[PDB]
Amino acid sequence: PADVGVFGCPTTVANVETVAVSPTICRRGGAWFASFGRERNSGTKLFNISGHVNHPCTVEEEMSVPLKELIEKHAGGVIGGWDNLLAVIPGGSSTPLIPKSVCETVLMDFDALVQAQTGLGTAAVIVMDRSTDIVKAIARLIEFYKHESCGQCTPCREGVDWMNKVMARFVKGDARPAEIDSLWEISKQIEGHTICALGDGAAWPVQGLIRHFRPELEERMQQFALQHQ
Amino acid sequence: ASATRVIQLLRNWASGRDLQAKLQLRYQEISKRTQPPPKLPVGPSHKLSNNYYCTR
Numbered sequence: 001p002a003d004v005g006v007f008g009c010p011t012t013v014a015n016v017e018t019v020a021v022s023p024t025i026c027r028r029g030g031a032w033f034a035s036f037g038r039e040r041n042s043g044t045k046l047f048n049i050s051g052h053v054n055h056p057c058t059v060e061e062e063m064s065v066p067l068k069e070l071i072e073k074h075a076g077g078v079i080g081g082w083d084n085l086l087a088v089i090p091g092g093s094s095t096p097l098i099p100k101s102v103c104e105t106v107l108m109d110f111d112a113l114v115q116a117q118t119g120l121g122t123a124a125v126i127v128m129d130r131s132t133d134i135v136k137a138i139a140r141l142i143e144f145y146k147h148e149s150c151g152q153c154t155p156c157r158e159g160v161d162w163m164n165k166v167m168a169r170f171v172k173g174d175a176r177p178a179e180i181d182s183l184w185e186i187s188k189q190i191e192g193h194t195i196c197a198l199g200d201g202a203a204w205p206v207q208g209l210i211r212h213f214r215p216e217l218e219e220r221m222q223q224f225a226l227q228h229q
Numbered sequence: 230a231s232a233t234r235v236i237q238l239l240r241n242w243a244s245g246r247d248l249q250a251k252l253q254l255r256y257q258e259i260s261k262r263t264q265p266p267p268k269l270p271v272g273p274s275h276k277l278s279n280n281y282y283c284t285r
């Protein structure tokens with residue numbers, strides 16, 4: 001876009017928050033903004049906290065704030081106590097989820113969350129306690145991605161519809177364990193081959209759910225095989 | 230076979246072997262012409278994953 005953008009003219013696309021904070025950085029200096037956070041993760045960030053929390057809310061906070069501190073301080077904590085936490089998606093639907101153990105001592109910046117194989121994304125924390133069907137939530141996210149794809153390139157279009165069907169079958173446990181790895185491969189055949197990042201943002205949630213809750217999927221399909229003989 | 234005893238002894242003596250032990254005419258010992266359905270197992274490259282064609 002810096003060469004051929006809108007109307008064929010040079011263009012630069014910037015988020016609302018970035019341009020909104022730009023004049024304050026100019027007025028108060030760049031060093032003051034760089035003071036907050038770690039190196040290469042400077043500044044303050046707006047965090048939306050939603051899901052299974054007592055008080056879901058939007059709060060502006062220093063960048064490298066721990067996830068547990070952010071939940072307990074502003075959001076009022078996980079409903080039913082911290083031990084009731086099951087999983088958390090820290091950067092909206094695109095970023096993969098992390099379990100309780102990983103999120104016990106994790107920070108919110110790009111580098112630390114990339115180290116946790118997730119990424120900060122847009123800093124949209126969605127929490128889920130132990131009393132929810134995480135497979136159902138991830139299937140709903142994949143269905144959302146299926147509904148919201150332009151469909152011009154075959155990988156995203158066909159593969160995301162395929163993953164939606166596979167995840168809908170997983171929710172009931174109608175598949176076989178050998179399919180799970182297959183799904184992983186399907187995701188790897190989508191990520192990196194599409195035009196935009198919607199394909200990557202649809203492949204990542206499936207990869208994270210598989211990587212962190214393969215036993216849950218296997219248990220559910222074993223139960224389905226047992227009831228249906 | 231449906232052969233009398235005397236003829237059987239005559240044949241066994243003339244040939245020098247026991248004919249009725251190993252006959253050359255097929256009888257009920259053969260398999261039936263109607264058989265149960267088979268199953269025919271699939272080959273080794275019927276995996277659902279780690280089965281890219283460029284490796285095999």
Ligand SMILES: Cc1cc2nc3c(=O)[nH]c(=O)nc-3n(C[C@H](O)[C@H](O)[C@H](O)COP(=O)(O)O)c2cc1C
Nearest residue numbers: 012013014015016017018019122196197198199201
């Ligand atoms: C499918 C898709 C949807 C996106 N939606 C948004 C959005 O709604 N808001 C946003 O700020 N960025 C969104 N992005 C990220 C954009 O790439 C981003 O706005 C743009 O690259 C400029 O980002 P920046 O202002 O942080 O530099 C989306 C990216 C993808 C692939």
Ligand code: SF4
Nearest residue numbers: 150151152153156194
């Ligand atoms: S990956 Fe992007 S460009 Fe390709 S079909 Fe999906 S939304 Fe359209």
